[PDB]
């Protein structure tokens, strides 16, 4: 193909503009993933109590830090209890001689007038709206594991209708499905709807990643291939910082998502004047409009060579892709064949581990550290130079001591946070950054060596396995934290177990790397 391109210019304004605009959407894109960081923040909370908050009431001689002493019992965590209120106000417990056993604990009940929420750092949340808290606490991660399940039926359904639809055009409606949903769910009336649209909205959202990255590929020269990846991965890398901007300023979670939303009505604005994919459209057999497509790029470029080009030129040197149409292949032959199983389930275990570690960890903050914005802000300052770190140790070290070592500083990052005392907040924010980061840099490394690892026809669908195997083990990211009922240790040694056992695997790998 890249003849053509050639011709057309194969990197130039128009790739420059294409990149451009397409990076600044994989930006917002990021934004959407990770809001319920901060739409979903679970400010601290109590009991609604008669003392403390009908102040129509006769009035109070004694300040608020005695009446809630008096009026809410204390905690394991040694802190106001989260769930239970004294049954009738305990004025016993504010004498000095006075004890936790001058009570018996069915003298507590639960909040039956529901929940009073904490202002200072967020105006409201989905957790404060829809009270998901105490008996109903499952039901934050199963909203965060709905989004990714929807990211995973959205990727299986994209592939067909992208080969039957196009490129660009699939790539439109999901930018409009993405404004749609977005908007929706900002202002749902109800917990489920609220679901169904973030489900929604997911299943656009794997449509964007995609065809982002493929129209990118059948646009792009080979000899400028490997750049145009690498900044599509830093889009994501801003994406984060961005994150941290706009929900600093944005308080109130229904304005966050629709403010993070809006943009897209923009990008499906824009995306009606990026051309479409030529491969594409000469492989469907459709070369008068693919050369019309050659010939606005041309246009854009500046070019002067446009005058060549006809169909019967189109044909003659496409005929190189027209001709893989005669090789199909599936997943069960990476299993079925000797040789290749023992890769296939090592390289599928290592794209498992990135999905599930990142989205574990990426999605619960507030429990990392002691400040949510700079958190945020850091895994992503933190991600740029583990990805170009990442990239240059790839060439000079080659690709499997890499990724083991890169798996492995994540793994034990992660796990070093279980022993780290919880009074070093600033120690334990650091590792779980250098966790994140290393992460990032391995998912680096394992999209190029899944792509090395096996025979040419196979390859596709290896990284196919691959990516998909990623979208599955994300769903099971955040049901993970469910554990931490039993300590808030146990969700973190899972998560930083899963990368050093596939960092350890990946020293079976072959290398790859010529020398
Ligand atoms: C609040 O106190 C007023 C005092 O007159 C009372 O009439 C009202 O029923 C109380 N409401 C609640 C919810 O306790
Ligand atoms: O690893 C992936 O490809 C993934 C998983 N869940 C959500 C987004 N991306």
């Not at 934004?31 to 739409?39: G, Y």
Request: glycine share 8%.
């Amino acid at each position: 193909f890249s003849e053509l391109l050639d011709l057309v210019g194969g990197l130039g304004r128009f790739q420059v503009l294409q990149t451009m605009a397409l990076m600044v959407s994989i930006m917002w894109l990021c934004t959407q993933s990770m809001l319920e960081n901060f739409s979903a923040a679970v400010p601290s909370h109590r009991c609604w109590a008669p003392l403390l908050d009908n102040s129509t009431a006769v009035s109070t001689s004694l300040s608020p830090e005695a009446l809630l002493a008096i009026s809410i019992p204390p905690g394991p965590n040694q802190r106001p209890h989260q769930c239970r209120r004294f049954r009738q106000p305990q004025w016993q417990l504010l004498d000095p001689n006075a004890t936790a056993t001058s009570w018996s604990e069915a003298d507590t009940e639960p909040c039956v007038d529901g929940w009073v929420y904490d202002r200072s750092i967020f105006t409201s949340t989905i957790v404060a709206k829809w009270n998901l808290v105490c008996d109903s606490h499952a039901l934050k991660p199963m909203a965060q594991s709905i989004y990714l399940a929807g990211i995973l039926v959205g990727a299986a359904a994209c592939g067909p209708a992208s080969d039957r639809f196009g490129r660009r055009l699939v790539l439109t409606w999901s930018y409009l499905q993405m404004a749609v949903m977005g908007t929706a769910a900002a202002f749902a009336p109800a917990f489920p709807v609220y679901c169904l649209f973030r489900f929604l909205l997911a299943f656009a959202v794997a449509g964007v990643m995609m065809n982002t990255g493929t129209l990118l590929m059948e646009w792009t020269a080979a000899r400028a291939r490997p750049l145009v990846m690498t900044l599509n991965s830093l889009g994501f890398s801003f994406g984060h910082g961005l994150t941290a901007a706009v929900a600093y300023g944005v308080r109130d979670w229904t304005l966050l998502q629709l403010v993070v939303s809006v943009p897209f009505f923009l990008c499906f604005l824009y995306s009606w004047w990026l051309p479409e994919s030529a491969r594409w459209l000469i492989i469907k057999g459709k070369p008068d409009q693919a050369l019309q497509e050659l010939r606005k790029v041309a246009r854009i470029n500046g070019h002067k060579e446009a005058k060549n080009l006809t169909i019967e030129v189109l044909m003659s040197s496409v005929k190189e892709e027209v001709a893989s149409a005669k090789e199909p292949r599936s997943v069960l032959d990476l299993f079925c064949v000797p040789g290749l199983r023992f890769r296939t389930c090592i390289s599928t275990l290592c794209w498992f581990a990135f999905g599930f570690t990142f989205f574990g960890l990426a999605l619960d903050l507030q429990a990392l550290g002691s400040n949510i914005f700079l958190l945020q802000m850091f895994i992503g300052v933190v991600d740029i130079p583990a990805k170009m770190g990442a990239l240059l140790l790839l060439s000079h070290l080659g690709r499997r001591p890499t990724l083991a070592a890169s798996l492995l500083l994540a793994g034990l990052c992660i796990l070093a946070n279980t022993l780290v005392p919880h009074e070093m907040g600033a120690l334990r924010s650091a590792l779980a950054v250098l966790g994140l980061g290393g992460v990032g840099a391995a998912f680096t490394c394992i999209t190029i060596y899944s792509s090395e690892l096996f025979p040419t026809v196979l390859r596709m669908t290896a990284v196919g396995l691959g990516q998909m195997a990623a979208r599955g083990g994300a769903i099971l990211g955040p049901l993970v934290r469910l554990l931490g009922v039993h300590g808030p240790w146990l969700p973190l040694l899972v998560y930083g177990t899963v990368p050093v056992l596939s960092g350890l695997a990946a020293l079976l790998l072959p290398e790859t790397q010529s020398l």
